[PDB]
Symmetry: C5
Subunit: 395 residues, 5 copies
């Protein structure tokens, strides 16, 4: 007619159309929603409140049996857009979410032909996830998102995947690669959910694989922790007996405590787990404290009237395996002989006070061995963490 | 007829239906809402603002006497879903809440048959609770949630439990066990509420039992506080008199103050209570300060012209119970005898300055006893706190 | 008739009813709103942004002359509930508020009989108040809430109190007593408000009296500040002259600075006032600094060639009131006499360097007096603050 | 008639009334909005994000030519209130704003007579402003608010002031004077805005004058910075040469660094400017560092084998202007003479090591002069800042 | 007619007008939206969450074929404003955004003539961007904003630029120049977007060029880092051998660590990059630590019984290139000769302990060379960063 095609097509469709009833002619046939997920960016991974922020491009389609027309009647048009609030829209929600509402709504949907309705929308999802930092510098996380209908059972709503699973697994078309986390794989999975003997529901789980970039954390933390070899080589060659070691070890302890003072403002906080690097740091702290204490005992003993046991019961264990594994003229001469002792009184002080450096080292040597074993353990665990991080790129 | 069943059933029901009036044919019969609560996760327990964040799956049903139909008239269908905003929905609210609004709405409800209407919805509840941290590492909390109608009295609205109470007590089907707090029991309870002589209301209280996981806090706090035995064994065997103790005790005091500097960033803050562990920490601080002061007095006395009272009035109390519980030739000889005194002047300095180590220990020994009693008290209170924590799993 | 009573009663009332016009038959009679306030909890008192968060149960009623019916016509029912958005609701707002919107709405109101309409609603009020912390540990606050209509004058809207004032003064039926602040009195007051010569408005002020619980702040702050007697008794009996005091006072200054380092994370921050306890703390700091400086001068003078003025002009003021208020044989003997002076050269060093401890104390004694006066002032002001806090419970 | 007056008056007005068209009979006449601004409180001045929070009581009126009636027809009533959402309301917005939405809406407006419509509403405005802290303790700020229509040009909407400008300049009727900032003047101003050659817009700028209260900041910051005279008088009279100054200056440097450690938690942060007081503080820090360094050189030189140049090229400049601006008997006697040198070897050590205190002071005296000039500059700039602050109350 | 023109024109237009259909008579012609962007202010650049906050004045127009009229029929009016919610409005969104919703809506649009509809609105955009701080003090950022339709393809919606590109490039008419960042260029760009073989979309990218103001950061950070020349000139001229250097270098290390303690509260935090200035700071820290260690070895060696290798294998490399690139009378005489050795025993101690200052400097000199090279590198990199910053103003 003279009326333009789109206006009278919308009049023919939307008038005498009841939004709020499931668009099926036979109620025994469930409606099928085919959803798709495209990854855009990873905005934040809190790893203290166990929640991550993500931004996802989302689309889905279903069949609306009451929106059908013959094209050549309405001037041969095969697609139009009508407002979302005037048709039936299913309720698809995420099971795990903390706060949603910063994602806007799109008030337009295509109704292509034969009832094909398509919805395009962005998503600002803040979803709870179980984030572990056991291997902090080299983390690989394994988070899930579940799509389902909160009310409709599987006899009313089915969920299917839009594309083939392989395309969804490797889809990095619009991802931002200038952040901190690197996307690896989005793995879809279908499940039937039921926690009671009456009703069952359809779910579509998406597993998101992310991986940290360790360069920043390596150059900012590991090399100052490589300085344990510096402290070892400055504490080894320096005389272990009374000298400047006590003071210089104290200064290095203050420095290595200032380092962990700075580090605590950068390492993540979590109330259920701690990084293994922190375990190695506190082990190094304990060994430094025991080293300082042992140096204090050795300094004190050989300079404050050493009365150590010559042959105590511990000597047997000391020697069993440690040495294997690791008129007035007469009065004038009398007083001259009496005052001649000043030379001895000036000389016999060092010989008194320089006794037992030999026995003091039996503990410094063992503690040096402990330092080297600790450093070797740190190196091997760092290498194996890097290996586990690097082998995760196969998926 | 030719019209499909669901559309004309919705037309028959919703047309000439007035939302806003209580759906009863006789106004003397109150409507009964049967509610249920399923526990999902404990997102946050603030324990500083006395509020916890929780996520609960919720459902309820009531009877709508104006939504009834004979199935075989409408093509034998016995269930349909209609929008929530087109029927009467009761107002069930939580008495204690700080901020709600991050939980979305579900715009669909089943109207099964004979007026059975079911509502399914998630809940993001941020509810105030009285959280105590007296036994911080081993806490067991006891929080409540109250469901009632804010306007309708008990003559208009009754609240009943959906399932049997035993099922609600032990329902951990969908709980997340990868967090910090562990769920123990959800105990329902019915009460009739009235704060005036005219109106009474129906409530349904739910008591949520949670329990902290102490592993993280134990390995991160207790063992550095186990190092009090390290400080005791390094302060005992080291000479108590003038030597290196003053300085070494000062260094340990700086270290044990750095520890509580770090701890204050991890211990919770509350303006109405403090953990008992903090009480033991400050007691240890006070004892360390008194030890350092006593060492300073002992160092000062025996090296700066000791003029202590030989037999003061305190000697009686010192000995009563402490020792039980715990031509020119003549001038030449004259000047030789005069200058012979240099040996004595060089020798009689140590004997002057090494007087009274015996009396100085009467206080170091007692203070060592005080340290051991404090450590024993710490150990026994830690054991009893763990026992109280472990016996709470029976419920 | 056959139609049930509630439905046709709602039809008779709400149909041909215009929401948006004040429900009076004669426009010269103002409508009267009778409000009531019940106290539930005090969620937060910020005392840095001068705002407090409160939770109040609220109710009010007015007369709607267009909602009237004869009961026995409509099957003898004398109460019903109708949606709030379908009738006229007055605009009652708080004058002082920072952010509202976290309190939900109740979409139901009773219309009892003869036009009696009742509204029940919770309130999440975040209202600005003038909070002072002059007596921080023992605060008693005096905050107001004002209820009025923002547009309607007193010729259109009147505000009256629901119950008698005495009941509102003492109403602690549902208060939570497990928080930090204690409720004392809610005092209603009526006022007529007008800031221009044309229009006047009706207000209903509510004064909320709250009171801090000082136990936590006392046990956490006062006793370490009771340790000023510890520092006084360790600085008094220790020799004031050159010895270990300079160093030990330095150590106590570092400790008493670490204390205020910790305290600054717990004391409240306010840009218009400071607690008097902080004034006493900084006075103690200044006195400690002046003590350390005076000890440095006394140490320096009596050990570095004292050339003080014997009788300067200050001696008169020093003594006026301070002492009241507070062949070759000849050469051989010659060289022997020359070398005999070594005894004097070894002995006359202490006598040179031990001059004037007597004059040094004239300042240490006065400064000790200053410490005791400062401690007495601290004690008396703490006692009077506690007395003012305790006498406030009469109201 | 029998129908009450207000209901049929509202029926006569609102029926057949089209909201959404500008209420003028002739479209060539712009509508005039007469606005007013009343100041209530200044909630926050961020001075780090360059934004302030304000609370303003607001009102405006315009003429609605379609809402007119003869009073004696409708029972002689000359005012009524009708809902805001049923009439035409202009769009008046602030040009500069960061976040609005915490101010509620008032759903009622008076339509007095002959089309006089009045709107009363509160405002929660968070507006960006250029805040400078050059004179932090004594700031006077100069912030603007602009009211205009975002779409309608001046041919459609005009903005006029309700009252006379003088009344708006001095209007402190409802201001809260218990905060931090003091209101001085609200200066209205009219401008015609146009950034293109086609369209012009009408604006009404309001300049808000505020002023800080300096008491808190003075008593909390200036007096500890008055202690520079304390450090000057303790560093002047103390011997400048080797003694206790190096150590005592180090202790004062640690104290004066602890002071600025505390201050950094209270001084405001701004990325475009710094207070001049901070400049004086860092100048004092630099002068203290140079003083400590110069003392170290002087201590080192006169005690470690001084080999300074006697007459270098700098001596000319040193003296030009600085001094103006500022058998066996023979062997027995031989060995006696040889050993007689012990007296000289014991005596000639001080005379060697006490050389050149005279030359060392040439730098300490000059640096003392620098300290006094710095203190004088600090005092004069503080006085002039106070004078500028005090003279701002004339407006 | 008697009815005023605007009311009946609005009646003629809006009645029988269907909002929700694209306003084209022929559906094969896409609608064209001509957009414009005007820059107002840069509120925040987070550079830790990789997001910036911006405020933009925005406008656009399109053609509405169903809103057309002949002017002289409706009393010769050629423009009117009608509510936005009563006509068709396209959906133009930004691809990258984190949170929107603090920008209000303007419920009025001009419909000029022949279907010309204009929309004016402000925008509060919080958009994600890739912010780098490699050259922190002198940053130039390069951020994008993309405008497109989220649903409509290019066959339905086209996007064109309102003005010429040159005007948009240089448009600083209403910019605020009192902030931290300086606007340089807004560069528009058109692109056709398609990530699939079926649908294509039209985009309009806007590149926003901003530039930091370095004055504040220069005066607050660079000059204290210019004090490395102060530390170099106080560590060079001071004797490198045993003396006061160890202690004075320790004090400078504590000062230069306090500086970076203060700096960490002002430097930005980013998990993907670090400023080069921080790299130079940590290099200076490492060199200071190695200097202190080398001084400790040199102090220890020449004072604790030096037993260094005289001619080790390292001597060849030491000398190859380093020196090029950089009765009783007999007994009386016997005892006199025996006691005559006291002079030698008092004299031969310094000569023993003053051995090898010559060899110790071979490392201090090299380390001084390292300091000068580090300072030169710092200066040249600062100059080149300033040059890159200054040359960016050409665009
Ligand atoms: C629609 O298709 C028919 C048959 O294929 C064709 O004749 C007609 O031209 C098409 N519509 C238009 C508007 O061209
Ligand atoms: C409904 O039930 C009747 C009787 O049980 C049965 O005959 C009929 O087939 C059922 N409806 C349908 C659609 O099959
Ligand atoms: C209402 O009151 C009348 C008279 O008191 C009484 O007869 C009647 O039974 C009452 N209504 C009902 C439903 O009982
Ligand atoms: C309105 O004014 C008229 C004339 O002044 C007066 O007679 C009449 O009484 C007034 N209306 C009422 C309701 O009194
Ligand atoms: C509109 O234009 C016509 C012809 O140009 C003119 O005669 C008429 O006066 C104009 N309208 C009005 C209201 O003046």
């Amino acid at each position: 007619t003279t009326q333009p095609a789109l206006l009278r097509l919308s009049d023919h469709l939307l008038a005498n159309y009841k939004k709020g009833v499931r668009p099926v002619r036979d109620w025994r046939k469930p409606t099928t929603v085919s959803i798709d997920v495209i990854m855009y960016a990873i905005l934040n991974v809190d790893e203290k409140n166990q929640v991550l922020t993500t931004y996802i491009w989302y689309r889905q389609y279903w069949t609306d049996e009451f929106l059908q027309w013959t094209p050549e009647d309405f001037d041969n048009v095969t697609k139009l857009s009508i407002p979302t609030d005037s048709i039936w829209v299913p309720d698809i929600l995420i099971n795990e979410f903390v706060d949603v509402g910063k994602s806007p709504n799109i008030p337009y949907v295509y109704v292509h032909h034969r009832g094909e309705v398509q919805n395009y929308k962005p998503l600002q999802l803040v979803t709870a996830c179980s984030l572990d930092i056991y291997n902090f510098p080299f983390d690989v996380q394994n988070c899930s998102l579940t799509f389902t209908s909160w009310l409709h059972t599987i006899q009313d709503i089915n969920i299917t995947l839009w594309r083939s699973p392989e395309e969804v697994r490797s889809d990095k078309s619009i991802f931002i690669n200038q952040g901190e986390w690197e996307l690896l794989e989005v793995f879809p999975q279908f499940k039937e959910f039921s926690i009671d003997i009456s009703n069952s529901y359809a779910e579509m789980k998406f597993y998101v694989i992310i991986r940290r970039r360790p360069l920043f954390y390596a150059v900012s933390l590991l090399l100052p922790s490589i300085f344990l070899m510096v402290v070892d080589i400055v504490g080894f060659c320096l005389p272990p007996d009374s000298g400047e070691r006590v003071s210089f070890k104290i200064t290095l302890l203050l420095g290595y405590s200032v380092f962990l003072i700075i580090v605590s403002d950068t390492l993540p906080a979590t109330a259920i787990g701690t990084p293994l690097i922190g375990v190695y740091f506190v082990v190094c702290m304990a060994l430094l404290v025991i080293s300082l204490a042992e140096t204090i005992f050795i300094v004190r003993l050989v300079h404050k009237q050493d009365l150590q046991r010559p042959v105590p019961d511990w000597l047997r264990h000391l020697v069993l395996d440690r040495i294997a594994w690791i008129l007035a003229v007469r009065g004038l001469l009398q007083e001259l002989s009496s005052i001649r002792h000043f030379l001895e009184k000036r000389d016999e002080m060092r010989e008194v006070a320089r006794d037992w450096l030999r026995v003091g080292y039996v503990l410094d040597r063992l503690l040096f061995r402990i330092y080297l074993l600790a450093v070797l353990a740190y190196s091997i665990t760092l290498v194996t963490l890097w290996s586990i991080w690097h082998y995760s790129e196969n998926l």
